[PDB]
Amino acid sequence: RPTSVEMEPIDDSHHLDKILLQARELSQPIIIDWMASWCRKCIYLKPKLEKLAAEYDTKIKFYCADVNKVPQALVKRGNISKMPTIQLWKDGEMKAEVIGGHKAWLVIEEVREMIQKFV
């Protein structure tokens, strides 16, 4: 098992479609970290999300999307209004989310609670 797993960037809406089709084949959820590079809490959360991703290696794939870099159509799929927003998707749709803007460890514990409900 790795100690940290890097989040995979989502390129566009078509990539999200392929990601969700792959997740459906495996009967697994996915996590998407919707972030911005100017957002201090997003940046500080990254290493802690990568350690959490390693805990779920082979069980849940973790992705990220930079809301200023990706196409607007992809951001609309997420229905994002604040960053960081950590969403759990399963069966082709967003099932639940966590909004950051707190200390990173505490965001992770809330994300873990969300994961445990749906995995």
Our count of domains for the chain comes to: 1
Burial code (b: 16+ CB inside 10 Å, e: under 16) for 87-117 equals bbbbeeeeebbbebeeebeebbeebeebbee
36 is in which domain, residue-wise?
A: 1-119
Catalytic one among 10, 23, 35, 39? 39
Give this entry's resolution in angstroms.
1.6
Identify whether 35 is a catalytic site residue. Answer: no
How is residue 102 annotated by DSSP? S
- 64 appears as a binding residue in the annotation: yes
Method: X-ray
Q: Token pair for residue 48?
A: 């802690």
Burial of 46 from C-beta contacts in 10 A (0-12 / 13-18 / 19+):
middle
